[PDB]
Symmetry: C2
Subunit: 124 residues, 2 copies
């Protein structure tokens, strides 16, 4: 079972000076979104645009994915994204990320019917 | 199973939330700490002091828990904590919370051998 002491630690402890800092965004989001279980996903992009705008990318510029697959598309316009990358100090299960906010074109793989994004390939 | 489409949203979508927002702490933390599974925990407090400083509360002022038990202790100094409370708009699985930074004495319940904090009782 989860011991009572360990439960208390999970439910109530967050030791630090600036826990509510924006630079903590990735740590909490990478955790909330389940990408730190078993291992630390090294890199991940969050997109801050409407889902209608991201879904629209599936009918814009065609391009080859990084893995050779041919179902990739590049957004016509730049989008507000947050880039999360493990720090040189991150070691599972103590995953740590640096948060970076930039505006870049996103490249995603679309699949399914209707055709929707099913993989974030890269940003340019 | 989880659809590839849903997976994309969970992993790369964050509309309606800005990284540079201090007000978002609770929503991200309540989710990261797994207290939004099954139902939204109505209230939860996070402590920002050291684990050592919090464990030391078990040797401070003895008081009665809100539920009548007698293993509760109150900190001598005020501590830096974050108050998380479900908004009136909150609706599982879309749990919403208000983040309120405060500085009050905390009352925790102690148990085990050695006696460490095992339940957050209240702040005062």
């Amino acid at each position: 079972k989860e011991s009572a002491a360990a439960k208390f630690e999970r439910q109530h402890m967050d030791s630090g000076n600036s826990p509510s800092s924006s630079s903590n965004y990735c740590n909490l989001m990478m955790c909330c979104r389940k990408m730190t279980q078993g291992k630390c996903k090294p890199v991940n992009t969050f997109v801050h645009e409407s889902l209608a705008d991201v879904k629209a990318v599936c009918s814009q510029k065609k391009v080859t994915c990084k893995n050779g697959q041919t179902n990739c598309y590049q957004s016509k316009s730049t989008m507000r994204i947050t880039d999360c990358r493990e720090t040189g100090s991150s070691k599972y299960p103590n995953c740590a990320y640096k948060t970076t906010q930039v505006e870049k074109h996103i490249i995603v793989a679309c699949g399914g019917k209707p055709s929707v994004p099913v993989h974030f390939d890269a940003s340019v």
